[PDB]
Ligand binder design. Structure first.
Ligand SMILES: [Cl-]
Lengths: 166, 223
């Protein structure tokens, strides 16, 4: 909606300029990391890792010429600096996880995610084809890891902490 | 605004600042004493609007007014297709007295002319990634529809046009949303969206094509 997405200090989340941690509201002891999935040799899947807190920071990007993010905007989400597109999130079918969040090194002008208010924080919602129907991102437990993946109706709820510790 | 300069003070007296908790988040354009045109993506349930500004500190700007607005109307086809029809009209709670520093501008009836040099103004990011203290102005030139569609299809729609992309790296940037693009004395566009980062050679920015909406604007203001 028309609500501005805010950080844990109540300040608007910026459009690309600043990085933020997605801190799970009931898993502050864990944080986002990359892991291997399937038979891949390099880690390209996004997990919630109990050994890293607060985890890898993200940037939220919209092509609109505005410097804040609203819940209604389609977003790219990416690891790494603004200048790099090697950490851009997408959702990719990968057995046996399902529709897994993974990183890729290409980026569409308009990404497929939205950040939507849920409970005490926000959920990440993936819209296949940037259509009207959104699928909640939650956790899928496989191979001793908690993968971020589509789990509609069971979102992982996050607060968004500006990454000023770096 | 990338690679621009301070505007001559009050040279763009239609410029409106949309502020939230005392910080600018978009611009708009005074088009009637009681109406501000801005990008529909800047929609909020209420607004505080700064008119007559140069710096954003109204307490240092004689002739300025900070005015409230509750009502705004997004174009009914905003975001279908995605990013298209990016305009809204904000009705001020009261009509403003126009002056030499607060003045409406006429909207172009004719659509953009490829190649024509125009002016964009705003308080958005500079080349150095910082916010300016005063309103910035820069010239950008209209790009042909053929080039706009080549670069931006499948998201190019004739409610848009492209400008900029010069060797000069002159561009609008984040925080310039909703502000004016003036061509040949008339309001031609609103800052809307673009490919990041700002100021890339060969990459124009995208502006709301207001020549397509003159009837809807007139009808909305009159209703
Ligand atoms: Cl916190």
């Amino acid at each position: 909606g028309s609500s501005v997405v805010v950080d844990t200090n109540g300040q608007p989340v910026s459009n690309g300029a600043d990085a933020y941690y997605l801190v799970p509201v009931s898993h502050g002891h864990a944080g986002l990391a990359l892991a291997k999935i399937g038979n891949e040799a390099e880690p390209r899947a996004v997990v919630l890792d109990p050994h890293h807190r607060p985890g890898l920071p993200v940037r939220f990007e919209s092509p609109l010429m505005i410097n804040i993010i609203k819940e209604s905007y389609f977003l790219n989400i990416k690891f790494g600096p603004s200048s790099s597109d090697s950490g851009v999130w997408d959702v990719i079918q990968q057995d046996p996880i399902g529709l897994a969040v993974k990183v890729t090194d290409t980026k569409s002008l308009l990404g497929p995610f939205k950040v939507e208010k849920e409970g005490e924080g926000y959920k990440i919602v993936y819209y296949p084809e940037r259509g009207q129907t959104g699928l909640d991102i939650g956790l899928v437990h496989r191979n001793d890891k908690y993968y971020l993946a589509v789990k509609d109706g069971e979102p992982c709820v996050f607060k968004i902490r500006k990454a000023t510790d770096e | 605004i990338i690679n621009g300069e301070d505007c001559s003070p009050h040279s763009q007296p239609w410029q409106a600042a949309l502020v939230m908790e005392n910080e600018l988040f978009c611009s708009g354009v005074l088009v009637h004493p009681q109406w501000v045109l801005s990008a529909a993506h800047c929609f909020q349930n209420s607004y505080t609007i700064g008119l007559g500004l140069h710096s954003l500190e109204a307490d240092q700007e004689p002739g300025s007014q900070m005015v409230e607005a509750s009502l705004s109307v997004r174009h009914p086809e905003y975001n279908r297709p995605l990013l298209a029809n990016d305009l809204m009209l904000i009705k001020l709670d009261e009509s403003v007295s126009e002056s030499d520093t607060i003045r409406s501008i006429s909207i172009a009836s004719q659509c953009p002319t490829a190649g024509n040099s125009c002016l964009v103004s705003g308080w958005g990011l500079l080349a150095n990634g910082r916010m300016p203290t005063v309103l910035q102005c820069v010239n950008v030139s209209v790009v042909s529809e053929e080039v706009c569609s080549k670069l931006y299809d499948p998201l190019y729609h004739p409610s848009m046009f492209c400008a900029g992309g010069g060797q000069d790296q002159k561009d609008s940037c984040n925080g310039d949303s909703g502000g004016p693009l003036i061509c040949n004395g008339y309001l031609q566009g609103l800052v809307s969206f673009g490919k990041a980062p700002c100021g890339q050679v060969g990459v124009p920015g995208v502006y709301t094509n207001l020549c397509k909406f003159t009837e809807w604007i007139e009808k909305t203001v009159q209703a």
